[PDB]
Subunit: 326 residues, 2 copies
Amino acid sequence: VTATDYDTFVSERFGSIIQAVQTFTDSTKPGYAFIAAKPKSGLYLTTVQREDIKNYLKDYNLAPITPSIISPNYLFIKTNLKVTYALNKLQESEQWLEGQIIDKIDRYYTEDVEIFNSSFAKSKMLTYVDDADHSVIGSSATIQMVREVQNFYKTPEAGIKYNNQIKDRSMESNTFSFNSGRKVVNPDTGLEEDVLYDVRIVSTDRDSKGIGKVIIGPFASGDVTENENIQPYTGNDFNKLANSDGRDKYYVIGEINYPADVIYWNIAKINLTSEKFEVQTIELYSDPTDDVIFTRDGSLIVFENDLRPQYLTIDLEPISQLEHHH
Amino acid sequence: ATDYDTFVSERFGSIIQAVQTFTDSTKPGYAFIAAKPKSGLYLTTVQREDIKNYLKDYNLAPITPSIISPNYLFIKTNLKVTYALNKLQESEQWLEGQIIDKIDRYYTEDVEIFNSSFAKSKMLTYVDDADHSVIGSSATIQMVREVQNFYKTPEAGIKYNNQIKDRSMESNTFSFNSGRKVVNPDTGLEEDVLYDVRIVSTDRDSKGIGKVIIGPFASGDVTENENIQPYTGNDFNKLANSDGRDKYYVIGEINYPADVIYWNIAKINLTSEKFEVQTIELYSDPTDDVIFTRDGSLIVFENDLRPQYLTIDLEPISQLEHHH
């Protein structure tokens, strides 16, 4: 028993295609012993869905509790890097240089951060970035935590957490398409099926107890049917998106507990069927109050640029030389 | 630069830590040498007359190089370091000391030098480096140019050698003296009412230009004739009041892209006499986190003597539902 004993158990019987193990138990889900497992190479163990994992299921000794071999709950860092260097000090291209900083940003992660109950610090990685040339003068960054959400429709039973604290309104997802039942025409073309607009999930400033709503919109006046319950969110209090289509009526569908660090929603709370949504997986961005981001239970801060390039933009800036004369 | 600076840097290496020459495009004919005491900030007028009197040593009859103290750019740093409770042995008061040293060691080595530059990203890695227990830091900077005369910018202008943001330029506050009597038996029979005032900049125009406007007044004590009339824009930062004061006026102007700042209080009929200061400090947010020096400007951390330009917030961590 004991998660620690189990972590080993697997750092042996598998200690081949596995880099790390976190055996934690969830207080919401009794009798279930959860086993986080980093593939040591990629991201998901049997993304093929357990052709390998299921194998770990197939390891049994004692107890009335049952294993649930999962892939680690990944925290991502959407970094907007802005390194600046000296035109002259540089001998190879900006292209070769990028491939030089991300070689470092990786060295940091995989040595200090990509570990269980281990953490990430922006200041500490920007030291690694700075440390890629004779110049390279300095560097800026703007990060957000990312949680990848399977089934956009609704969060888990027990909500999703970051293992970190975010700021008011900080929480927002990427946009996805909502197929309004309605139909419209332009450019000599026809019905064009059903009108679609870009819609998304955002949080609101916390109330006097640490608790804002999780709202979704915009909409039409519209494509969502209003009840005694279902009513457009009452007031400004968050981040609205570009109505290049003019729209705006958002609806409440959950809440963030900022202090408790839990976020729940369920689109079924209004009456939209997942059919009315193109997507399956979405991204949930928030920006921390943390100058240090903590991983934790089954959570793991990882940097996989190749397979997750989207989570890193590098904007370089070249600089004129100074005094060359003496 | 070094052609004559170096020498000097030999006969005086025991004081001066930074020497460079330059001309002023404009003050044609004049060559100045900025020098920073290793021992602080401003060389003393005796230290300065000695050093000037080696100019005779090396024979030159023409008026020959003015020695002078460097044009300092200061970084008002608002630092935040979060550290691990377990791994920190001594006092918080100690830790600060330990890092406020690191900052200086970075400044002395990589920054306090002519045309070398300050990189917030670097000094933070110095901060990180100060203890084995300093998990991670963050930081917010401002630029401080310390103005010799508040009343009017130099003939030419004042510049940061760096890009600031909109409304960003703002001096501190200085007492303006209206001229009215207060009639208060508390302190006799007459105090001469004097309310604070500052000089801020407004938003870039179509074309890159802002207006350098000057803090709140009470209608009467500034005379307006058509031309010189209250500024109206709300495109700047107004200040905390307790008084009925909301009349700001326009002098000079900021050329944001060419960073030049000229103003002249005279543009409103207010003699120096009217203000009880002679020196001020101009702040402003950089655009970037890498800031630069140029002709005779020097960036410097002199913290036991400019302590007002650093503040440290620590955040002790354990494990852990919370660090703000």
